C-alpha cells in the first residue's frame, strides 16, 4: 500500500471504530518521511488519541479497584497484576507516539502550526506517562512534559491568534498539566482564565473553518474553571 491508500484505509478504520487499525495506518504514513498534511496530521492525532484513551480508561478503572480491595488480599493482588499489564500496554503506546515525534513530526515542522501541534502532542503524551509513573522516573518525564508544553505555549503566543483552536487546545491541556501533575491549581486556573479571556476579547478573528472548534475549547476551558473553583 502507498500513501493515498493508507489515508483512505485510515479513514475507514475510523468509521469502523477500529483504532489500532487506524493507528498503524498513520504510523506507516508518518514513517515514509514526508511532512504530514493538516488532514493527515489529524487522522494520526485521532488514531492515537483513541488508542491511548482506551487504555488510560481501563487503567483508571482497574487502578481504582486496587484501592477498593484494600483488605481483600487475594483480590488486590489480581488487580495489581492486571494494572501493571495495562500500564505496560499504555507505555508502549506512548513510546511509539513520542518516538514518532522525535524522528519525524517535530524536526519536519516547516511551519509554526505544525511545531506547536506536534510539541503539544509531546507534552500530552509524556503527561500520559506521568499519570502512570513510577517513582524516580516521574520527575524526569514530568519535566520533559513541561518543556514541550513550554516551547509550544511560547511559539503559540508569538505566532497564533488567541482564538486559534490549537492555541486554545494547548492551553486547556497545559492547564490540566499544572493542575493534575504539578499539582498547582492556582496556576492552572490563571493559565486557563487567560486563554479564555483573551479569546473572548477577540471574537472577530474566527476564520470560518474553525469557529466551532475554538468555541468548543473555550467552553471546555471555562468548565475547568467552574470545577476547579467549586
Amino acid at each position: 500500500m502507498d500513501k493515498n491508500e493508507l489515508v483512505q484505509k485510515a479513514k475507514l478504520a475510523e468509521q469502523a471504530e477500529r483504532y489500532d487499525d487506524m493507528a498503524a495506518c498513520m504510523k506507516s504514513v508518518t514513517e515514509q518521511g514526508a511532512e504530514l498534511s493538516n488532514e493527515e496530521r489529524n487522522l494520526l492525532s485521532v488514531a492515537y488519541k483513541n488508542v491511548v484513551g482506551a487504555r488510560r480508561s481501563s487503567w483508571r478503572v482497574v487502578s481504582s479497584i486496587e484501592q477498593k480491595t484494600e483488605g481483600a488480599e487475594k483480590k488486590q493482588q489480581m488487580a495489581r497484576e492486571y494494572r501493571e499489564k495495562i500500564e505496560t500496554e499504555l507505555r508502549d503506546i506512548c513510546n511509539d507516539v513520542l518516538s514518532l515525534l522525535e524522528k519525524f513530526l517535530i524536526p519536519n515542522a516547516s511551519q509554526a502550526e505544525s511545531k506547536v501541534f506536534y510539541l503539544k502532542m509531546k507534552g500530552d503524551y509524556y503527561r500520559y506517562l506521568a499519570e502512570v509513573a513510577a517513582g524516580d522516573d516521574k520527575k524526569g518525564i514530568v519535566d520533559q512534559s513541561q518543556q514541550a508544553y513550554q516551547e509550544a505555549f511560547e511559539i503559540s503566543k508569538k505566532e497564533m491568534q488567541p482564538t486559534h483552536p490549537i492555541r486554545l487546545g494547548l492551553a486547556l491541556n497545559f492547564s490540566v498539566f499544572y493542575y493534575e501533575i504539578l499539582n498547582s491549581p492556582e496556576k492552572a486556573c490563571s493559565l486557563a482564565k487567560t486563554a479564555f479571556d483573551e479569546a473572548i476579547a477577540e471574537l472577530d478573528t474566527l476564520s470560518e473553518e474553525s469557529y466551532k472548534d475554538s468555541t468548543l475549547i473555550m467552553q471546555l476551558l471555562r468548565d475547568n474553571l467552574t470545577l476547579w473553583t467549586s
Binding site: 488519541k49 491511548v52 484513551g53 488510560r56 503539544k120 500530552d124 500520559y128 487546545g169 486547556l172 491541556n173 490540566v176 493542575y179 493534575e180 471546555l220 468548565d223 475547568n224 470545577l227 476547579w228
Partner: peptide
Amino acid sequence: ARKSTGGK
C-alpha cells in the same frame, strides 16, 4: 471530571 483534548 476535567476536560482535555484527549477527552471523551
